[PDB]
Paper text:
We report the biochemical and structural characterisation of a beta-[name] (β-CA) from [name], a unicellular parasite responsible for one of the world’s leading sexually transmitted infections, trichomoniasis. CAs catalyse reversible CO2 hydration to bicarbonate and proton. CAs are divided into eight genetic families: α, β, γ, δ, ζ, η, θ, and ι14–17, which can vary in terms of amino acid sequence, oligomeric state, kinetics, and inhibition and activation profiles. α-CAs are the only isoforms present in humans, whereas many pathogens have been discovered with only β- and/or γ-CA genes in their genome. Here, we illustrate a full biochemical characterisation of [name], together with its crystallographic structure, thus providing the first detailed characterisation of a protozoan β–CA.
The crystals belonged to the space group P212121, with two molecules per asymmetric unit, and diffracted to a 2.48 Å resolution. In agreement with light-scattering experiment results, the two molecules in the asymmetric unit form a tightly associated dimer characterised by a buried surface area of approximately 4366 Å2 and many hydrogen bonds and van der Waals interactions at the interface between subunits. The dimer formation produces an extended β-sheet core consisting of ten β–strands, where the N-terminal helix of each monomer extends around the other monomer. There are two active sites per dimer, which are located in clefts at the dimeric interface. Each active site contains a zinc ion on the bottom, which is coordinated by three protein residues, Cys37, His96 and Cys99. In one of the two active sites, a water molecule is clearly visible in the fourth coordination position (Figure 4(B,C)), whereas in the other active site, this water molecule is not visible, probably due to the lower quality of the electron density maps in this region. Our crystallographic analysis clearly indicates that [name] belongs to the type I subclass. Indeed, even if the water molecule in the fourth coordination position is clearly visible only in one active site of the dimer, the aspartic acid residue, which is coordinated to the zinc ion in Type II β-CAs (Asp39 in the [name] sequence), is in both [name] active sites, very well defined in the electron density maps and far from the catalytic metal, leaving the active site in the open conformation. As observed for other β-CAs so far structurally characterised, the [name] active site is located in a narrow cavity spanning from the protein surface to the catalytic zinc ion. The comparison between the [name] catalytic cavity and that of human CAs showed significant differences in dimensions, being the latter much larger and more accessible.
Numbering used by the authors:
A (entry chain B), B (entry chain A): 1 to 182
The structure:
């Protein structure tokens, strides 16, 4: 059985076990956006750890949960949609210990790409841009502090929207407040 | 209680109820990456719907789960890290019906920003770039098909990594295969 088949299969079983679900509002009912990491350990974990339930928040996830730009990015656009289209009033940026964006570099990714038959010329072309995500990621806490700053100083983001910074431990699920944005 | 206080509070309760949890591998154990939407309705839902458990996959989320670029983005970088650093062998891009990005436009976001006291000059500066996310998002299915294409044609992504396209219904949780990438 392929991974697709397993998903198809699991979905069938899911629909059987969940025959009639209540329609939820499309807008987050706590008016909050969470930005966090793609880390496998946070899946079906992080939200329970912060007491966030289905229908309550938008959740935005990328490797290292970073905003290093004050222009636009996938994450930034997600926040604009959250605020302006979906009524979000608070942003929580939540990094995690042992992120492994910490010990990821353009060198190591480059090496891996070469192994995978990626053209060296292509690796060089993108190395500089890629650096902005993986090499600038020094430390989880620093990244949180910096990310909270970059969202704040974004000219498209209203001054009356608090931006908080949190750190979650991927094993224990302990959350520690880094920045209170009120 | 503020939203931060609620989170702090819930975390305390979470740690009490979950005193000692088994450490999981930092790498996804099914070697799969899921790209999906930030939609409030998919939180604590989408993963169960596809039978994906904690520790099995990386999950990447942005408004409209779109890859329109063959350069770099938050989503793309997340996929590179997944494959090269974390051993991911398959990518599933999963859009949803009633996506908020369909009826989001630069006009509507602009209007909202103007309301919020954002400088008109700033709105005009970003309008062209912003267009690439919100205006190009025509239809969920078309976005899935196009996103699967843009990941495929990305020169940094190996040819031997299948890219699948799925559609989930945000109410029922029914998943339908759009593209099989094997
Ligand atoms: Zn991480
Ligand atoms: Zn959506």
């Amino acid at each position: 059985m392929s991974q697709l088949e397993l998903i198809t299969s699991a979905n069938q079983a899911f629909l059987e076990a969940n025959p009639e679900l209540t329609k939820l509002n499309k807008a987050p009912q706590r008016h909050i956006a969470i930005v966090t990491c793609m880390d496998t350990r946070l899946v079906n974990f992080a939200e329970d750890a912060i007491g966030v339930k289905r229908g309550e928040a938008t959740v935005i996830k990328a490797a290292g949960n970073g905003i290093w730009t004050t222009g636009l990015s996938d994450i930034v656009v997600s926040l604009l949609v959250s605020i302006y289209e979906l009524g979000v009033q608070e942003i929580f940026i939540m990094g995690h210990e042992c992120c492994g964006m910490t010990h990821a570099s353009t060198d190591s990714l480059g090496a891996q790409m070469l192994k995978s038959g990626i053209k060296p010329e292509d690796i060089e072309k993108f190395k500089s841009d890629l650096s902005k995500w993986v090499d600038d990621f020094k430390d989880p806490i620093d990244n949180i502090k910096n990310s909270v700053r970059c969202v704040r100083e974004n000219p498209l983001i209203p001054k009356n929207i608090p931006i908080h910074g949190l750190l979650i431990h991927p094993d224990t699920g302990k959350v520690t407040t880094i920045i209170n944005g009120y």
